[PDB]
Amino acid sequence: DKITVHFINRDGETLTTKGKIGDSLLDVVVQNNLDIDGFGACEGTLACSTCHLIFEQHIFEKLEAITDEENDMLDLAYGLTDRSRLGCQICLTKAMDNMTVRVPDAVSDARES
Amino acid sequence: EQTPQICVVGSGPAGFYTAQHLLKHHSRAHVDIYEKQLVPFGLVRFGVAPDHPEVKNVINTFTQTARSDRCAFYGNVEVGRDVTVQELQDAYHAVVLSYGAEDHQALDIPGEELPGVFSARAFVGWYNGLPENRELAPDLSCDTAVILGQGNVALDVARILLTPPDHLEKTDITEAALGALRQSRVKTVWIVGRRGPLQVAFTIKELREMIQLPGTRPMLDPADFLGLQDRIKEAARPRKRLMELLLRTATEKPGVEEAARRASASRAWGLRFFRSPQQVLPSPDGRRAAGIRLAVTRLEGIGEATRAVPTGDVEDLPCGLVLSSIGYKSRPIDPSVPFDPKLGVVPNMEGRVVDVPGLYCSGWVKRGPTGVITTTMTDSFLTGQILLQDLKAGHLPSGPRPGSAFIKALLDSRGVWPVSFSDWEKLDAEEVSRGQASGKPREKLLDPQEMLRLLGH
Numbered sequence: 001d002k003i004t005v006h007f008i009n010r011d012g013e014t015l016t017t018k019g020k021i022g023d024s025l026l027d028v029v030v031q032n033n034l035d036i037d038g039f040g041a042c043e044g045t046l047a048c049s050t051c052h053l054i055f056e057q058h059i060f061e062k063l064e065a066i067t068d069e070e071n072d073m074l075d076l077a078y079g080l081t082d083r084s085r086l087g088c089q090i091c092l093t094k095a096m097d098n099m100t101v102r103v104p105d106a107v108s109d110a111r112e113s
Numbered sequence: 114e115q116t117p118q119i120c121v122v123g124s125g126p127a128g129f130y131t132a133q134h135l136l137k138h139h140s141r142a143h144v145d146i147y148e149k150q151l152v153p154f155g156l157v158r159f160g161v162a163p164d165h166p167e168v169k170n171v172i173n174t175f176t177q178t179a180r181s182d183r184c185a186f187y188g189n190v191e192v193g194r195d196v197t198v199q200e201l202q203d204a205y206h207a208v209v210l211s212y213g214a215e216d217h218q219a220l221d222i223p224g225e226e227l228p229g230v231f232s233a234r235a236f237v238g239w240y241n242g243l244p245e246n247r248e249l250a251p252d253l254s255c256d257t258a259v260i261l262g263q264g265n266v267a268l269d270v271a272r273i274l275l276t277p278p279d280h281l282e283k284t285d286i287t288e289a290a291l292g293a294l295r296q297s298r299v300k301t302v303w304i305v306g307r308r309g310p311l312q313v314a315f316t317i318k319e320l321r322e323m324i325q326l327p328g329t330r331p332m333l334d335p336a337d338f339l340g341l342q343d344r345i346k347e348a349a350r351p352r353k354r355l356m357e358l359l360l361r362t363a364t365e366k367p368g369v370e371e372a373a374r375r376a377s378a379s380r381a382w383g384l385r386f387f388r389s390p391q392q393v394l395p396s397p398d399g400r401r402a403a404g405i406r407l408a409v410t411r412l413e414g415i416g417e418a419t420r421a422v423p424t425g426d427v428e429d430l431p432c433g434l435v436l437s438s439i440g441y442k443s444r445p446i447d448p449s450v451p452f453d454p455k456l457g458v459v460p461n462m463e464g465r466v467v468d469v470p471g472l473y474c475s476g477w478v479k480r481g482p483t484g485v486i487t488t489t490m491t492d493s494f495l496t497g498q499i500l501l502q503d504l505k506a507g508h509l510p511s512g513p514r515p516g517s518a519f520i521k522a523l524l525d526s527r528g529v530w531p532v533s534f535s536d537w538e539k540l541d542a543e544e545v546s547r548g549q550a551s552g553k554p555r556e557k558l559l560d561p562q563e564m565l566r567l568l569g570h
């Protein structure tokens with residue numbers, strides 16, 4: 001890992017770690033063994049929404065153009081914001097070093113009905 | 114410290130995610146997963162379509178959990194039959210029911226037993242290798258097929274029915290079903306719902322796949338989307354994009370390329386609205402189903418208990434195959450556990466089974482058959498947590514607990530031989546080999562007795 005990334009887990013706790021550029025945040029999460037409740041279930045294949053992440057505004061603006069394939073899975077995600085993206089679709093870049101991504105928590109009991 | 118003994122009834126997503134949560138958030142807790150089938154994973158194996166392999170990837174995470182030293186698998190054990198819930202409650206500190214929703218919603222209409230009428234989920238288990246469905250042998254010689262209900266399951270069987278057979282060649286779809294699908298003369302599939310477009314139960318991913326299915330064209334009536342535009346523009350995010358895709362497809366003239374594609378299409382799928390199945394119409398010799406009588410309905414009686422009610426006008430639809438995909442319901446498996454026949458679930462307060470200390474539940478048996486795998490996952494974590502929370506607070510049986518030491522001896526006395534996860538791995542390896550030759554991920558073993566012969570059982 002050449003760049004650093006901060007993950008704000010659902011329990012407030014922060015998990016700092018480094019991942020070499022080119023890797024999706026799912027790669028950063030998986031290989032670094034971060035404990036994020038059921039993160040990346042389909043293993044980054046656009047079949048779930050468990051890798052959902054909330055990026056910083058100053059970084060969201062310059063991320064790869066979101067596809068329909070990603071929006072299709074993102075609509076089914078809870079805790080959706082205006083800076084949400086599927087973590088496994090975002091490959092790290094040099095400008096992302098030290099950024100802070102937040103894993104959506106809040107009240108998702110609403111999705112269970 | 115105490116070494117928690119937890120039992121999970123059912124090895125599908127809800128059971129494996131509850132166990133996953135328990136193992137992750139308690140370093141000494143042990144989880145034993147019971148399953149009536151010979152193999153694990155439930156609907157991820159038997160439900161998720163074979164042309165949806167990406168979704169079956171959650172199996173890798175369950176396999177990792179099952180491999181944990183604090184987890185054990187016990188297939189070929191039908192709780193409530195081979196072992197009672199009361200007996201599991203004596204052996205463990207906590208028991209979690211995660212046996213999904215097996216029962217199928219009957220149409221309850223004249224002629225629903227005519228040959229050619231199947232449960233959409235029986236058709237699915239057919240091509241997905243569920244043993245009980247391997248001899249379904251549906252007659253696909255007729256041109257039209259009608260699917261009652263507009264959920265994702267409906268789109269799944271409609272998609273499998275219209276997908277060019279060759280495109281399914283290298284999926285883990287049973288060779289038996291693929292063979293039948295090659296001889297199928299089904300070219301028209303109608304998905305009929307009791308309500309309107311704003312009520313479709315499917316997601317945009319599965320719909321998009323349908324709209325772009327090779328060799329097919331969509332049959333949507335623009336009239337079903339009249340004075341419905343402004344309501345779409347105001348819908349919530351999850352709903353909006355879905356509806357806009359339907360409205361677009363139903364009312365916008367396709368580009369030169371798309372039109373050419375449709376003019377070339379040899380198969381078609383469509384959506385019917387405001388029609389409830391009134392009766393399955395028989396063939397001349399009355400030996401099979403030849404069509405279905407649909408009653409025109411109206412939104413009448415709104416509020417919480419909203420429902421569509423027949424106006425009195427009917428419409429007879431020609432069709433040789435009728436698939437019922439109108440949801441399902443769990444079923445009681447033990448007289449020791451309470452049951453809500455109306456909602457079709459085990460009465461519970463956020464996971465805690467009503468009036469039964471130490472008894473919990475998760476998945477479809479807890480919330481109903483309306484959640485995808487991600488929904489089931491986050492729901493199952495909540496149950497695992499409320500259980501750990503009761504443990505910490507001291508609200509679960511104190512002390513000892515023999516767990517499997519007791520149940521093993523018990524099942525032994527009863528002549529029930531359990532299938533361990535490692536036994537499953539020998540079977541798994543076998544199915545994967547059989548998939549080598551034909552270039553498929555695997556070739557599922559369908560014969561119950563052969564699967565057991567393999568394991569030495």
Ligand SMILES: Cc1cc2nc3c(=O)[nH]c(=O)nc-3n(C[C@H](O)[C@H](O)[C@H](O)COP(=O)(O)OP(=O)(O)OC[C@H]3O[C@@H](n4cnc5c(N)ncnc54)[C@H](O)[C@@H]3O)c2cc1C
Pocket residue numbers: 122123124125126127128147148149150153154155156157160161162165168190191192193211212213214215234237266269446475476477478484485486487489
């Ligand atoms: C046709 C179909 C297609 C689907 N496609 C998708 C998809 O593409 N993507 C998606 O995200 N979701 C999909 N789903 C939904 C997904 O399958 C469910 O959300 C998931 O299976 C729910 O898990 P569960 O643990 O509640 O139960 P299940 O997976 O049903 O598992 C319950 C388990 O309990 C076992 N069991 C039952 N009774 C007993 C007993 N008495 N003793 C012991 N074991 C018992 C069952 O055999 C089974 O293995 C689909 C569902 C269907 C029906």
Ligand code: FES
Pocket residue numbers: 026039040041042043044045046047048049050051052073086087088089
């Ligand atoms: S890990 Fe499944 S969509 Fe990203």
